[PDB]
RNA sequence: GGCGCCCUGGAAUGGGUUCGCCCCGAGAGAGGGGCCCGUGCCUUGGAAAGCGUCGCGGUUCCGGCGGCGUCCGGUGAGCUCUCGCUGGCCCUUGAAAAUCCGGGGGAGAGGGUGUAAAUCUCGCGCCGGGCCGUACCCAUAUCCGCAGCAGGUCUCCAAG
RNA sequence: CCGAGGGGCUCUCGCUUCUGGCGCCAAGCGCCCGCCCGGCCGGGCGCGACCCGCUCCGGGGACAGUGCCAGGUGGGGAGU
């Protein structure tokens, strides 16, 4: 009768993110005349740390073409950039590390982070630490390129999706074990309220579909359909298979 | 001192007699002066070496 | 002469600040502006029925100038001159008791509810009709109705302009019922110059649909495909 | 005309001055808190007595809506004395007490004699 | 006390240094400077007031009256506080704004001289600073628990 | 393409990449008034900074959505 933990996360009273000490939205600069038709010069001033993000950020200042003013962006910092470095941005930008330029101009097999999934979106795909995307297969007519997402999914995008050359800094972060319960506490204290996760088997029938019984067992099959209502989608959701893996995935 | 006590002071205990007085550190002043000279001078050199390429091609 | 020097400003990408140019297209207008502009486009983009497309074919300005000259001296009574006329009839009625002093005061009628009764009774002799009536259905029957009752009509530009003839803001229709006899040859001179273009063409002006033209940014890329297709042959 | 900004901000129009053709309340109301309503009575306790000759301060009880400027003018005008400083207080019955110090040209122990006490 | 400030000058037979480190041809050691904190001392305040002691007046307001003293050093893993330097730890990186200052620019402004202007964040002098809170308990008896209830209830100072 | 002092079946764009500097509030040229008897001031406009146009620019797009109806599913929940 009682609603369950998975349903209470959507209202967001104690389940909102912890967004105070973060430094801002890490977005590529919004497109204008300069990045459509040439390049604009920018210098990176510092390399900073968001709480809850394992990628470092870089703050890059740009001479404004219209106002006598300088203005500061926040980039997903590609790996191997340093402070006091010139970052160039636009169509006629040269393919070096850390530069950001359209995917229709960089050649095939290049390694790309922080790419737009639609033109103007200012960077959405492959933003976490260690991640990158590869471009393959340009199509000059009906201008559209495909890329390889870090999940192995190939996806066709626009030709003019603006994207920064290289791989995200901070890679290898999941090679060190958390190794004790306290360092998982500090890991999620900066992100959300989700970490001490009670198994649904170990609770009462009001609180979960799997709870109850004089033994800790599930009782019902752990795989649920996808049109199952909110309050029943627990366990393996709409699974195509189960058990320990045979092959890598062998299914599109 | 604190920011609001700086309102009581006079601009002799608040800056230094150089250019970029109470802002810059006097060794990056020294480098900004050299950096502005040495690369505006090459924008004469790369200008005029470009200017002798149309006249002798 | 001695020291004054040229010092130009490079305005390419990555040089001096772009100067304050026009920018009158790329300006975020209020939503009463772009509602007002997007529907002027949207009468050019949808297929307009020929009943609305009776209009946009108005009189050319040499004909509207002769027509407003003819309609000028038939100007109606206003309230300043309504005072002294009720003197001038009655001050002589106090002095001579005329059985009929005035045989015919002529005037041009105004008002769609007035002109409509004149046309179907065939009392009107020329029907100037406006251009930009806000609910277009207030007027749209009347070019179809002037044809059947044989009364000549003509579309003029601006419901504000013939509204100034009647000392008002808009008046949407005027009609000529009783013109002067000595000036009938100025009213009858322009009627065949009018009823050529409106009454006699009604078998054709009722077929002619309007609208249905694409924008210039999209009718260019249709032509850029066709210029490729003319190079695909030759 | 050219529009050097991408923004349409609404034009500065004219704003008239309110000059009505009848007053809404027909008469300025008189100040209820004038200089007799300021200062009710003087305080004549033992602690108020020995602050007169030892300190050149005479103590009153004032209406609670009076600031120390109104008290300074409503004692200078009623009792014809120069006022140095005033120290007010809300004493916990709910009435405001003022400690009005006089100029050294004056004395308090004789000004208190001509105001009754 | 601190300096990641400057000048001379150039270092291997490498040297200088810490409790630990660390530092040096991108300039060590050595020599001479410069800046910051100066909560310590002296001085002005300021001895006139405070305390200690001795003695005499004054019924009474008496912030009476007089004498003398308030002096030398030493030491510390001491305790508490503070300022400063230096490490370590983090899949943890440890607030915002109000306010205030400095710099870059150079639109302008100013008297025109054997005289003084614009300006002054310099030294003085002038006037003002309104409204509200302030007592006391802060608890094995002034709070909550029906009560002068072994309960509960946030802190600061701390000797041999 | 040919060829002759050149023509333009066909075309590209272009004016910032060794470096932790700087960049705005127009120079210049062209004109015009009040101002100097063919000389002196104080102002204004254009080109510099191309013309026209019907959506701010892109991405979708008669789909997705939304309104009503129908059929599945539905201990998520309701009543017994
Ligand atoms: Mg668990």
From Swiss-Prot, chain A:
Superkingdom, natural source:
Eukaryota
Q: Which Pfam families match?
A: Ribosomal_L2 (PF00181), Ribosomal_L2_C (PF03947)
Look up keyword Ribonucleoprotein and say if it applies.
yes
For this protein, the record's InterPro entries field holds: NA-bd_OB-fold, Rib_uL2_dom2, Ribosomal_uL2, Ribosomal_uL2_arc_euk, Ribosomal_uL2_C, Ribosomal_uL2_CS, Ribosomal_uL2_dom3, Ribosomal_uL2_RNA-bd_dom
PROSITE patterns (UniProt xref): RIBOSOMAL_L2
SUPFAM superfamilies in the record: Nucleic acid-binding proteins, Translation proteins SH3-like domain
Q: Where in the cell is it found?
A: Cytoplasm
Q: Keyword Methyltransferase: yes or no?
A: no
Q: Per the record, what is one GO cellular component? A: cytosolic large ribosomal subunit
Keyword set, alphabetical order: Cytoplasm, Hydroxylation, Isopeptide bond, Ribonucleoprotein, Ribosomal protein, RNA-binding, rRNA-binding, Ubl conjugation
Cite the location of the cross-link Glycyl lysine isopeptide (Lys-Gly) (interchain with G-Cter in SUMO2) from the record. Answer: 41, 148, 233, 249
Biological process (GO), any one = translation
> What are the boundaries of the region Disordered?
206-231
Q: Which residues carry this modification: (3S)-3-hydroxyhistidine?
A: 215
Q: Name one GO molecular function term.
A: RNA binding
* Record PTM text: Hydroxylated on His-215 by RIOX1. The modification is impaired by hypoxia.
**Matching SMART domains:** Ribosomal_L2, Ribosomal_L2_C
| Function in brief | Component of the large ribosomal subunit. The ribosome is a large ribonucleoprotein complex responsible for the synthesis of proteins in the cell.
Indicate the family of this protein. Answer: Belongs to the universal ribosomal protein uL2 family.
Please describe the quaternary structure of this protein. Answer: Component of the large ribosomal subunit. Interacts with CRY1.
Q: What else is known?
A: This protein can be partially incorporated into E.coli polysomes in vivo, indicating it can replace the endogenous protein.
Query: What protein does this entry describe?
Result: Large ribosomal subunit protein uL2
Q: Which organism is it from?
A: Homo sapiens
Curated annotation (Swiss-Prot), chain B:
Q: What protein family does this chain belong to? A: Belongs to the eukaryotic ribosomal protein eL34 family.
**Which ranges form a coiled coil?**
none
Q: Where in the cell is it found?
A: Cytoplasm, Cytosol; Cytoplasm; Endoplasmic reticulum
Please give the first and last residues shown and the length of the full protein. Answer: 59 to 115 of 117
Write out the function statement from the record: Component of the large ribosomal subunit. The ribosome is a large ribonucleoprotein complex responsible for the synthesis of proteins in the cell.
Indicate what this protein is called per its UniProt record: Large ribosomal subunit protein eL34
Superkingdom: Eukaryota
Q: How does it assemble?
A: Component of the large ribosomal subunit.
Position of the Glycyl lysine isopeptide (Lys-Gly) (interchain with G-Cter in SUMO2) cross-link: 50
Swiss-Prot record, chain C:
Query: Where in the cell does this protein reside?
Result: Cytoplasm
Chain positions found as N6-acetyllysine: 6, 69, 189
The record's annotation in Gene3D superfamilies points to: 3.30.1330.30
Recorded GO molecular functions are: cadherin binding; RNA binding; structural constituent of ribosome
Q: Which Pfam families match?
A: Ribosomal_L7Ae
Q: Which InterPro entries match?
A: eL8/uL1-like (IPR050257), Ribosomal_eL30-like_sf (IPR029064), Ribosomal_eL8-like_CS (IPR004037), Ribosomal_eL8/eL30/eS12/Gad45 (IPR004038), Ribosomal_eL8/Nhp2 (IPR018492), Ribosomal_eL8_euk (IPR001921)
The annotated crosslink position for Glycyl lysine isopeptide (Lys-Gly) (interchain with G-Cter in SUMO2) is 20, 69, 97, 217
Disease (UniProt): Chromosomal recombination involving RPL7A activates the receptor kinase domain of the TRK oncogene.
Family, per entry: Belongs to the eukaryotic ribosomal protein eL8 family.
Report what the protein is called: Large ribosomal subunit protein eL8
Species annotation: Homo sapiens
Swiss-Prot record, chain D:
Q: Which residues are modified to Citrulline?
A: 3
Question: Where, subcellularly, is it found?
Answer: Cytoplasm; Nucleus
CC terms in the record's Gene Ontology section? cytoplasm; cytosol; cytosolic large ribosomal subunit; cytosolic ribosome; extracellular exosome; nucleolus; nucleus
Q: Where is this region: Beta-like import receptor binding (BIB) domain?
A: 1-36
Q: Which residues carry this modification: N6-acetyllysine?
A: 32
What does changing residue 61 to T do? Found in Diamond-Blackfan anemia patients; uncertain significance
Which residues fall in a compositionally biased region of kind Basic residues?
Answer: 1-29
Keyword set, alphabetical order = Acetylation, Citrullination, Cytoplasm, Isopeptide bond, Methylation, Nucleus, Phosphoprotein, Ribonucleoprotein, Ribosomal protein, RNA-binding, rRNA-binding, Ubl conjugation
Molecular function via GO: cadherin binding; RNA binding; rRNA binding; structural constituent of ribosome; TORC2 complex binding
Please, which domain of life does this record's source organism belong to?
A: Eukaryota
PTM sites of type Phosphoserine: 5
- What are the Phosphothreonine sites (modified residues) in this protein? 7
Post-translational modification, briefly? N-terminus is methylated by METTL11A/NTM1. Citrullinated by PADI4.
Q: What induces it?
A: May be down-regulated by GNL2 (at protein level).
Choose any GO biological process term that the UniProt entry carries and state it. Answer: cytoplasmic translation
Q: Which family does it belong to?
A: Belongs to the universal ribosomal protein uL23 family.
Oligomer status and interactors = Component of the large ribosomal subunit. Interacts with LYAR and GNL2. Interacts with MDM2; this interaction may promote MDM2-mediated p53/TP53 polyubiquitination. Directly interacts (via BIB domain) with IPO5, IPO7, KPNB1 and TNPO1; these interactions are involved in RPL23A nuclear import for the assembly of ribosomal subunits. Interacts with IPO8.
**According to its record, what is known about the domains?**
The N-terminal beta-like import receptor binding (BIB) domain mediates interaction with IPO5, IPO7, KPNB1 and TNPO1.
Spell out the protein name for this chain: Large ribosomal subunit protein uL23
């Amino acid at each position: 009768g009682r609603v369950i933990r998975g349903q209470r996360k959507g209202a967001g009273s104690v389940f909102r993110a912890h967004v105070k000490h973060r430094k801002g939205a890490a977005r590529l600069r919004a497109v204008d005349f300069a990045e459509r038709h040439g390049y604009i010069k920018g210098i990176v001033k510092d390399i900073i740390h968001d709480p809850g993000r394992g990628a470092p950020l870089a703050k890059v200042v740009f001479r404004d073409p219209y106002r006598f003013k300088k203005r500061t962006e926040l980039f997903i910092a590609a790996e191997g950039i340093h402070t006091g470095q010139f970052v160039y941005c636009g169509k006629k930008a040269q393919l070096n590390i850390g530069n950001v330029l359209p995917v229709g101009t960089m050649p095939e097999g290049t390694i790309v982070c922080c790419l737009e999934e639609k033109p103007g979106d200012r960077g959405k795909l492959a933003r976490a630490s260690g991640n990158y995307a590869t471009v393959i297969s340009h199509n000059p007519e009906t201008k559209k390129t495909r890329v390889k997402l870090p999940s192995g999914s190939k996806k066709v995008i626009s030709s003019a999706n603006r994207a920064v050359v290289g791989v995200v800094a901070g890679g290898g972060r999941i090679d060190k074990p958390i190794l004790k319960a306290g360092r998982a506490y500090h890991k999620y204290k900066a992100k959300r309220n989700c970490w001490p996760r009670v198994r649904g088997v170990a609770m009462n029938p009001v609180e979960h579909p799997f709870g109850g019984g004089n033994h800790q067992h599930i009782g019902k099959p752990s795989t649920i359909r996808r049109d199952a209502p909110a309050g029943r989608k627990v366990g393996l959701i709409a699974a195509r298979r189960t058990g320990r893996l045979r092959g890598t995935k062998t299914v599109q | 001192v604190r920011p609001k006590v700086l309102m009581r002071l006079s601009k002799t205990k608040k800056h230094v007699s150089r250019a970029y007085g109470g802002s810059m550190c006097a060794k990056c002043v020294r480098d900004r002066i050299k950096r502005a000279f040495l690369i505006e001078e090459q924008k004469i050199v790369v200008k005029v070496l470009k200017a002798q390429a149309q006249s002798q091609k | 002469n001695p020291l004054f020097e040229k010092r130009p400003k490079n305005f390419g990408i990555g040089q001096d600040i772009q100067p304050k140019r026009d920018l009158t297209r790329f300006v975020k207008w209020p939503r009463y502006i772009r509602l007002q502009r997007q529907r002027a486009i949207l009468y050019k983009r949808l297929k307009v029925p020929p009943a609305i497309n009776q209009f946009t074919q108005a009189l050319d300005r040499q004909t509207a100038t002769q027509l407003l000259k003819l309609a000028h001296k038939y100007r109606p009574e206003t309230k300043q001159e309504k005072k002294q006329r009720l003197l001038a009839r009655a001050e002589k009625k106090a002095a001579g008791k005329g059985d009929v002093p005035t045989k015919r005061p002529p005037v041009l009628r105004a008002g769609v509810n007035t002109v409509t009764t004149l046309v179907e009774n065939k009392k009107a002799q020329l029907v100037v009709i406006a251009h930009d009536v806000d609910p277009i259905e207030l007027v749209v029957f009347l070019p179809a109705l002037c044809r059947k009752m044989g009364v000549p009509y003509c579309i003029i530009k601006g419901k504000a302009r013939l509204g100034r003839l009647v000392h008002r803001k808009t008046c949407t229709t005027v009609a000529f019922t009783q013109v002067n006899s000595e000036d009938k040859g100025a009213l009858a001179k322009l009627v065949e110059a009018i009823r050529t273009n409106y009454n006699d063409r009604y078998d054709e002006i009722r077929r002619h649909w309007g609208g249905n033209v694409l924008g210039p940014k999209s009718v260019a890329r249709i032509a850029k495909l066709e210029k490729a297709k003319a190079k695909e042959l030759a | 005309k050219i529009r050097t900004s991408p923004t349409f901000r609404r034009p500065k129009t004219l704003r008239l001055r309110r000059q009505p053709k009848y007053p809404r309340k027909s008469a300025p109301r008189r100040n209820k808190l004038d200089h007799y309503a300021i200062i009710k009575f003087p305080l004549t306790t033992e602690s108020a007595m020995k602050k007169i000759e030892d300190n050149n301060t005479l103590v009153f009880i004032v209406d609670v809506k009076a600031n120390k400027h109104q008290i300074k003018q409503a004692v200078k005008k009623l009792y014809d004395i120069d006022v140095a400083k005033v120290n007010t207080l809300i004493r916990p019955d709910g009435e405001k007490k003022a400690y009005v110090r006089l100029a050294p040209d004056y004395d308090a122990l004789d000004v208190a004699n001509k105001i009754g006490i």
